[PDB]
Amino acid sequence: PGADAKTVQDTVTQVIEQNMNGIDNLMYMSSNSDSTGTVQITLTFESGTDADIAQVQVQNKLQLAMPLLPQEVQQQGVSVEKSSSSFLMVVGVINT
Amino acid sequence: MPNFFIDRPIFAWVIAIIIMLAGGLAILKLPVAQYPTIAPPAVTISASYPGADAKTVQDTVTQVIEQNMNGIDNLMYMSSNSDSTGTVQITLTFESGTDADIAQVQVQNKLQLAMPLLPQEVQQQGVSVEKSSSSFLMVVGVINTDGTMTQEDISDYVAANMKDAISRTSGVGDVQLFGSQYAMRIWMNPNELNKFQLTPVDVITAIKAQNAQVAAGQLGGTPPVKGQQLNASIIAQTRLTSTEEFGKILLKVNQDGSRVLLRDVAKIELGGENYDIIAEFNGQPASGLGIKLATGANALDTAAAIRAELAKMEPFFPSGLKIVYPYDTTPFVKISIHEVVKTLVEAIILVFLVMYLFLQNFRATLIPTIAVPVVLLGTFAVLAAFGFSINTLTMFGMVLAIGLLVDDAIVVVENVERVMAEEGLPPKEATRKSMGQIQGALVGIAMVLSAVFVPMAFFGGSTGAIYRQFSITIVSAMALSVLVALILTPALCATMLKPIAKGDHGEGKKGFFGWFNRMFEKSTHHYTDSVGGILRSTGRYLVLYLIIVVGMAYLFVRLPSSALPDEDQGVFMTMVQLPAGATQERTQKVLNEVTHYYLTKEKNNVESVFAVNGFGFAGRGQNTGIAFVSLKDWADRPGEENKVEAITMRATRAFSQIKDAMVFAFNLPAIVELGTATGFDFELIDQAGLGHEKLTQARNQLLAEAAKHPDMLTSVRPNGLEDTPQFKIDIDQEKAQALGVSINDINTTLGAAWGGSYVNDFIDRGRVKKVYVMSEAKYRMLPDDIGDWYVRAADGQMVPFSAFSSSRWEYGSPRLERYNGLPSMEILGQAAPGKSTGEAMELMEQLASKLPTGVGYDWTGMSYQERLSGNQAPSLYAISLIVVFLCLAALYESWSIPFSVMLVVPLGVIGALLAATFRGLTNDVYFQVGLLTTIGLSAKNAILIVEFAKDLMDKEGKGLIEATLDAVRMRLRPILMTSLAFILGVMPLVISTGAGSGAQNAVGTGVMGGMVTATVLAIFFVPVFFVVVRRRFSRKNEDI
Amino acid sequence: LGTATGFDFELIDQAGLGHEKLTQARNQLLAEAAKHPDMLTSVRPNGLEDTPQFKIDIDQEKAQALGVSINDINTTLGAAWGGSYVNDFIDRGRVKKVYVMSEAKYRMLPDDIGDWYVRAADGQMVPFSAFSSSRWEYGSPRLE
Amino acid sequence: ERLSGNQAPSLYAISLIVVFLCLAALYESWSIPFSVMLVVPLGVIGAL
Amino acid sequence: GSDLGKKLLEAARAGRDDEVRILMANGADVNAADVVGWTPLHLAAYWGHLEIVEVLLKNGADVNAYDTLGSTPLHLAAHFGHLEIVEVLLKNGADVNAKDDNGITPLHLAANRGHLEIVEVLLKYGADVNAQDKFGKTAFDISINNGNEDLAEILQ
Ligand SMILES: CCCCCCCCCCCCO[C@@H]1O[C@H](CO)[C@@H](O[C@H]2O[C@H](CO)[C@@H](O)[C@H](O)[C@H]2O)[C@H](O)[C@H]1O
Ligand SMILES: CCCCCCCCCC
């Protein structure tokens, strides 16, 4: 929260990226670091890779970079998720 | 099945071609490696505490992590090292067949909930959890020929512009750097610090403040006010990028108004995170990467992939930067393969020659030339289905099976060529009758051979893992061979073979062939006459049979057993061990002597020496070193004098007049990921909180009793390091409080100055790296330098360390070991010449029980594996013997006749033992699988003899003696053909001296010896067995 | 899967050149791509262009001279303009976050920077204008 | 696309060889299978 | 830098009584010193090898040999509770009031670890009870700080 693209990249993104090794069936890795203080690192695995095994191997590597991240970033919580899945539906909620 | 495919020869071809295609396709896409997963899966937790001693690491990191290593499945044992370089390694070894992914994650999950209990300094360095059971594929070395870059300059480029791009290469797993990326070094000066009333605390505080990345929000940020025109990121302080910027850090403003910058109290340069390891390649500074192979990854692809990717960066490299390969296992795998393929091709062209000697036509000689290759290819498709790889074990598994695959071809083609010449039937009709006689036996043989080889796979541990590679390989190829023998070889026989005149045995021919046909016909008559005579007085030969069983049993006990034979792999190790307190500089002088020797006295044999200062196998620190000696290609190293074992002994002897430093050269073991394999591995454990000093006393007491038995035990030594002088400094809490000096300022000043401190990160050319503060070398060498360091009191005065501190010399461990979460000391050693490891282990146990109360012990490594794989060894032999009997019993429809076949086992064993004992080899796995393939082939010969004999007695109602002598006459030629082709097939393996010859010698010798005896003895004994067995075990049947 | 039509190219800095030099190289490639409308069509960057950023420099000397802690400065600037997650509270039985931040109207324009005071060691209140300078500078809103 | 390129021709070749061998076994002939495999382009021309 | 000197140091540390005797006869320097200034008599005292202490003193070893931080065999013997060795060293004229670089004496070290028997023997050989280390601490002060009343009584 409050951080610019370069602050996010040089305190969060690069630190997490440097620890993304010893992971099986990794094709490539890409990341965005933006002016809204948000970072997304995407690790894409080979077709037929066990998605459960892929997530846990990434999480395990992230988990040992957590102490190197700013306390402010840790407090917000660093989620590891399977992003390859698609939107079933979007529930919208309004007050008439 | 045979009759169906005899009428449809093209259908037969279609099946064979499909098998060949499936095989050739598997061969392309199968993973190729030196060995499969043999070593039990192992996960290593690695953490570092910069500046910390062995006991500080153990009592703040190791013990804390160890106490949380529970609720983990399939854990055999846990071991840990905590050393003077602030390093800890906890190794958790799991049972063979444990899912390595499941093992790693269960360890990581337990570590993850001990992380908050570890010192922040240890957490910041990062606590890695990795699969350590995997082996080094290759070591990439990196040097600068221009001599412009230091070790730290090279290490940075490799870390920041290579490590990651290499990890991305196809089939690459783990990667480990020989050094570190650049760290921003602040080399503090205590004179200058004291001059401005400053301490390391102020420096660290100033660095965190002025080297900071600040989040400052935005102009027109959310939620905004209405009418806002501009939205823009706010940029405040950003990480420093240069030594200049770090130099400008304003520590304080003096009263007079002058400035104290960081460069006024410190030297500022890019250096290493750590300086505890110095790496050299032929004397010049070097870094490098220890690359490991991934799960089911092609070693020959990964190797080529890296070499191609590194050549893609060659233009991107700075001037001088050259890639070298001091350690690579790819060249040995290519030869190991090429040599095995050569053996398979040589074996086929040998079957061609033997088939043309006996049958004397090119039409019959092509059937085994087609069938054998089809089965070899097909096996790979079966191996691919089971998830196996092309490796030394599966490769030699096919070489050992070639005798069984060649026999299935010969047996079929010979029996048709016999029937045609004896009866005068056309090829198509001759094959139907010929296949009718053997079809049922070939299926029975398959079930019997299965029962011989299959139980070998159900061995536990690493020995079982090795065995299972042969088991599945031999049974797969054998199963396909019988399928091809019931489909293709019948079809090929019916269509390709030309007819023979009734009673024509080629004795009407002229020249050499005419002589051989007349010679062998006479020999066959002499054989039947000799057997006929032997059968008239069986009693005598049963006593001769007992003498062979007794003789065998004697040779079996006398013959020593080994794990796997040593090989010249084009590399070996030289370990360096200077005495206690020895410095980096002293160790570098000894490594330079070792490097110079290899590039001088072994100039013709050695290509390069990769000297590593500060790492040994006993432990690490300034008094330890290692040298990877990379040899030139085997083609440029002719003679035993220029082999690894010869260079090893020459070097170890050359390092005798060495200037007080222990320097030994030694060859690698067959499987490096297993280690040594010879001798035992003992753990002495403190189990009553006795302490490290009392565990040493107990260790010394055991080693002294071990030296009293040189008859049984040999080289009983500790694996670890001895206690070294330590500089113990005591802080006086009273004097510290009296002077108003904070104990935190003291320990931070001492710690950061002498140990070094990781403050925060900075950005070097767009990459995040660490900032370290530490004393410049010359102010942290000797005890007198302690008084150069001042701390600031509450009142503002500067107090020296000498005011509130005392010091003395005291002994302590540079390497504290633990086993299963208790203080341990690992003791190595072996049984003396003649004695077995089992005997030696029994003595160590009795010696261990005399040690003080509270001291226990345990077995680890290969001793744990042996102690486990012991009770199951006899039962698997028993299971195999019972099932073989039941298979033979079903085939012949008799409880008695099976014994006539099973009695043939020792005939092959006596030869192998004599050949191995004569040539001075060992009872290794290659010898043991060699016996099973020899026993299997001798059993198959006995099955086909007894089948023919029993068939004649049942189908044509012939007498016992007539049927027996008819059988041995018909079955002599095919037995002598298989035996000869296979004996010649393994002759290159016996005389092999080149690369991979250690394994070839173990395979060939036992086989050649075993086949010779089995061939000669069986043709005389098998008929004796049938006659004796049939007479003793039968009602009022008939001898007429 | 996304689009599937066309290609997906990545231009990479592999010598620590920097973001500004990677843009130059990107612009150089896009200009050559526009010279071949025969072969290539709509060759464009996926990301955002560099935007004006408000760069504020703290004078460490003047801060130490006035007795203003650099921690008080960066916390005041950060918490006020960026916002800060302090700790949790209980809203109708559910744990949720507490944020401190400047009210909108005091963190919109550069002139609002001088509205913000930090307390020195001596107890006096020092404005941001005392120990800080600012200028316009370009930077990435989205670093890939 | 760059990856799934070298394997595209081989899978067509593997398919063609196995079809031939299947037809060869059925009719018990190395030649007659060609009389069937020649029918492939007749359907393709229409689709195109 | 004599080879036999380095062997004696290693031999006297491990407690090889017969190897010491052999190296003594072979003419090995009894007063050979470590990098830290420890002699065989320092190591024999520290690890508590009595026979070697007696053998080294019989072959004319310096009983008052001091390391680079001023500590003597008596300091080590008295500190780590080797009573029999403390008696032998003192019988062969060991400096009972020897000061290390910190001003610490055998009486301080013995009192530190509450070795009552050693303290009483040191006193019999005329150990200065009022002796102060660099911080002004006496054996009595050490005993009071540790809460050892038995030891405090003896030094009062
Ligand atoms: C007729 C009897 C049957 C005998 C056949 C037995 C086969 C047993 C050996 C099979 C090994 C072949 O396996 C194949 O080896 C070659 C090298 O030789 C490897 O190829 C590797 O080395 C070559 C060297 O020219 C490089 O060009 C290539 O980039 C690299 O990948 C393949 O990655 C592997 O798939
Ligand atoms: C039947 C009496 C003759 C026995 C001797 C037969 C020859 C045996 C040679 C091995």
Author numbering:
A (entry chain A): 50 to 145
B (entry chain A): 1 to 1040
C (entry chain A): 674 to 817
D (entry chain A): 866 to 913
E (entry chain B): 11 to 166
From the reporting publication:
The E. coli AcrAB-TolC drug efflux pump contains the inner membrane H+/drug antiporter AcrB comprising three functionally interdependent protomers, cycling consecutively through the loose (L), tight (T) and open (O) state during cooperative catalysis. AcrB is the homotrimeric IM proton-motive force-driven H+/drug antiporter component which recognizes and actively transports multiple drugs (antibiotics, detergents, dyes, and solvents) via the tightly connected AcrA and TolC channels across the OM, leading to an observable resistance phenotype. Four different entry channels (CH1–CH4) have been described with putative entrances from the periplasm or the outer leaflet of the IM toward the two drug-binding pockets, the access pocket (AP) and deep binding pocket (DBP) inside the AcrB pump. Here, we present 13 X-ray structures of AcrB in intermediate states of the transport cycle.
Structural analysis of trimeric AcrB-Phe563Ala reveals a rather unexpected TTT conformation and the c-loop with Leu674 appears to block the tunnel. Indeed, cells harbouring Phe563Ala are growth-compromised in presence of phenicols, β-lactams, fusidic acid (FUA), and novobiocin. Since β-lactams and FUA have been shown to be transported via CH4 as well, we realized that the c-loop may play an important role in drug transport not only via CH1 but also via CH4. We therefore compromised the entrances to both CH1 and CH4 (Phe380Ala_Phe563Ala), and observed indeed a strong sensitivity towards FUA, β-lactams, and the failure to grow on DDM by cells harbouring this variant, whereas wild-type activity is retained towards doxorubicin and rhodamine 6 G (R6G), presumably transported by the unaffected CH318.
